Design an enzyme around this catalytic site. Structure first.
Site, PDB file in Angstrom:
ATOM      1  N   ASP A  26       0.879  -1.158   0.000  1.00 35.80           N
ATOM      2  CA  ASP A  26       0.000   0.000   0.000  1.00 35.80           C
ATOM      3  C   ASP A  26       0.933   1.229   0.000  1.00 35.80           C
ATOM      4  OD1 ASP A  26      -1.876   2.051   0.700  1.00 35.80           O
ATOM      5  OD2 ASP A  26      -1.804   1.431   2.801  1.00 35.80           O
ATOM      6  N   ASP A  28       0.111   5.354   0.574  1.00 27.88           N
ATOM      7  CA  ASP A  28       0.016   6.453   1.525  1.00 27.88           C
ATOM      8  C   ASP A  28      -0.060   5.916   2.943  1.00 27.88           C
ATOM      9  OD1 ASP A  28      -0.589   9.382   2.203  1.00 27.88           O
ATOM     10  OD2 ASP A  28      -2.392   8.330   2.985  1.00 27.88           O
TER      11      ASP A  28
HETATM   12  C1  LIG Z   1      -8.407  10.338  -3.144  1.00 29.67           C
HETATM   13  C2  LIG Z   1      -7.563   9.337  -2.408  1.00 29.67           C
HETATM   14  N1  LIG Z   1      -7.864   7.992  -2.467  1.00 29.67           N
HETATM   15  C3  LIG Z   1      -7.067   7.079  -1.798  1.00 29.67           C
HETATM   16  C4  LIG Z   1      -5.959   7.524  -1.077  1.00 29.67           C
HETATM   17  C5  LIG Z   1      -5.059   6.597  -0.309  1.00 29.67           C
HETATM   18  O1  LIG Z   1      -4.784   5.449  -1.054  1.00 29.67           O
HETATM   19  P1  LIG Z   1      -3.743   4.378  -0.454  1.00 29.67           P
HETATM   20  O2  LIG Z   1      -3.504   4.703   1.021  1.00 29.67           O
HETATM   21  O3  LIG Z   1      -4.390   3.041  -0.717  1.00 29.67           O
HETATM   22  O4  LIG Z   1      -2.410   4.495  -1.219  1.00 29.67           O
HETATM   23  C6  LIG Z   1      -5.660   8.865  -1.007  1.00 29.67           C
HETATM   24  C7  LIG Z   1      -4.619   9.333  -0.028  1.00 29.67           C
HETATM   25  O5  LIG Z   1      -4.244  10.502  -0.092  1.00 29.67           O
HETATM   26  C8  LIG Z   1      -6.459   9.774  -1.679  1.00 29.67           C
HETATM   27  O6  LIG Z   1      -6.146  11.107  -1.610  1.00 29.67           O
HETATM   28 CA   LIG Z   2      -2.837   3.565   2.783  1.00 30.73          CA
END
Ligand SMILES: Cc1ncc(COP(=O)(O)O)c(C=O)c1O
Ligand SMILES: [Ca+2]
Ligand SMILES: Cc1ncc(COP(=O)(O)O)c(C=O)c1O
Ligand SMILES: [Ca+2]
Lengths: 288, 288
Positions: A26, A28
């Site tokens: 993953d 973020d």
């Molecule tokens: C619009 C949006 N969707 C999803 C995520 C996070 O996705 P992931 O944590 O799965 O990489 C973010 C995080 O900033 C986001 O801004």
């Molecule tokens: Ca995440």
């Protein structure tokens, strides 16, 4: 269930990382938080590559088409990656639609330009693209839409009266923490509005849905028994790992807390329990 | 539970209406559908009044402040009503807020001008009202907002970070059928978005919440044991009646179908089962 939420370190860490043929990350809360890389995350990835371990990336972020996503990685210090290693809810929503759109040989989109570019690059026709001097809408796609409005919501529901029109969501993340401590609404809140107003259940493309893994396994032979899933969100990344039969590692640099994970354990909600945790993914490096 | 979904007619009808001291009417799908009065509905009400039976009206519609609501009644043929007989989710949301706003002696509103007028008439201060040459927001109110947007949703969630800021919804109706056969998103879809993005549960003012009945009983002695609740929506009006201990009558001129009511019966979901039904409320007239 083997999910005991054990701190992964020492000989166990060396064992776990040793046997793993690959790692799914993953993004973020894992590799970075906003514009700041998690210290030691780039080094972990350099060292994975060198140890001959496959690294793949799974994000629910639907805002960037793949070329802009590739640039975010390199810029935050993650060098020498192939774009083929990068999977987002945008890319996979595009593929899912290409695979499931009904009718003989258009998609109404709630979402931004990155999302739309991704859909067009997969060969999809979007409502609101120009006519041929007015194509039937066969899917509504809900992504992250900063210009979401009541009118677009009413419009979505209109298309959805047709019970053969698909409803798809990129992901159900309810919100995402920002730099200054504030939160931004996620696609899951827009999805909830569309579902309530239409009376429909959406098909979810992103984690924790199996489809994302389906999407990843179309280009890569990855043995789920030998792949680690690493993320910061219990109800998304950990649930996802369990569903794909991967060994899950929760990192504590993101949305979920160790205490929440333990509480789930206490309550015997095992699919929401990580097998292991680490304070940050920098801690995985020493096991190589 | 006494709720058997019996067609109400004949001597039973005369008995039921005879013993009833009053009737609570839901409005849309009951008295009218859009701009068209249900034939015989005005006559039913003339005849109730003449039979010395109390008539009150309960609507989840948050779009009209009471004076504009009063005008809709008379115009559709319902003459000689007092404004004090008319209860909407707008009026009751205003009262609920006056009663529960915290802090020593402002409300952020997602909703239109009717809703705002109602809130101001109850003495409430709204965010976005002019400053005193910048008041703390202590409640977010979600009503029917045709100008709902992602920015207003993010703004609501910002206020909601404060765990002492209240979250209130006028109602959870998911949508409402229109004249031409189309549907418009209801407040329940906007509420769902705000709740998902904030992680909060809203306090619901309107049916099927007891609060509406609480609000009605502050000005009227109505014995729930002797009051009929008449509506067109199982999960709203019927559930509401059961919760207030009233005898419920479903009318079939609106949202819910007789078959849905029977299915609930079959499944033993008794609070979603009307005691009686009629094809239209015109059928109640002969029991007087
Ligand atoms: C619009 C949006 N969707 C999803 C995520 C996070 O996705 P992931 O944590 O799965 O990489 C973010 C995080 O900033 C986001 O801004
Ligand atoms: Ca995440
Ligand atoms: C915004 C809104 N809320 C609620 C309602 C219906 O309220 P009720 O059926 O309780 O009178 C309507 C029906 O048109 C409506 O437009
Ligand atoms: Ca109604």
């Amino acid at each position: 269930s083997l999910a005991r939420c054990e701190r992964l370190r020492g000989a166990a860490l060396r064992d776990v990382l040793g046997r793993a043929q690959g790692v799914l990350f993953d993004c973020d809360g894992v590799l970075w938080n906003g514009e700041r890389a998690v210290p030691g995350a780039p080094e972990l990835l350099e060292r994975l590559a060198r140890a001959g371990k496959a690294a793949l990336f799974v994000s629910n972020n639907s805002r960037r088409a793949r070329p802009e996503l590739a640039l975010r990685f390199a810029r935050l210090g993650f060098g020498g990656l192939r774009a083929e290693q990068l999977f987002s809810s945008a890319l996979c929503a595009a593929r899912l639609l290409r695979q499931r759109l009904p009718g003989p040989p258009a998609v109404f989109v709630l979402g931004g330009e990155g999302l739309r570019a991704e859909l067009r690059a997969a060969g999809l026709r979007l409502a609101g693209d120009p006519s041929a001097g007015a194509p039937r809408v066969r899917a509504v796609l809900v992504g992250y839409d900063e210009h979401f409005s009541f009118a677009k919501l009413r419009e979505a529901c209109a298309h959805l009266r047709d019970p053969e029109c698909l409803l798809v969501a990129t992901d159900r993340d309810p919100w995402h923490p920002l730099s200054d401590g504030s939160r931004t609404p996620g696609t899951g809140s827009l999805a909830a509005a569309v579902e309530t107003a239409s009376g429909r259940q959406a098909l979810v493309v992103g984690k924790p849905s199996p489809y994302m893994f389906e999407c990843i396994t179309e280009n890569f032979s990855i043995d789920p028994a030998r792949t680690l899933m690493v993320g910061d969100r219990l109800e998304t990344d950990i649930l996802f790992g369990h569903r794909c039969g991967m060994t899950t590692v929760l990192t504590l640099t993101g949305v979920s807390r160790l205490e929440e994970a333990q509480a789930y354990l206490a309550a015997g909600q095992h699919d929401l329990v990580p097998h292991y945790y680490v304070e940050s993914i920098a801690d995985l490096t020493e096991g190589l």
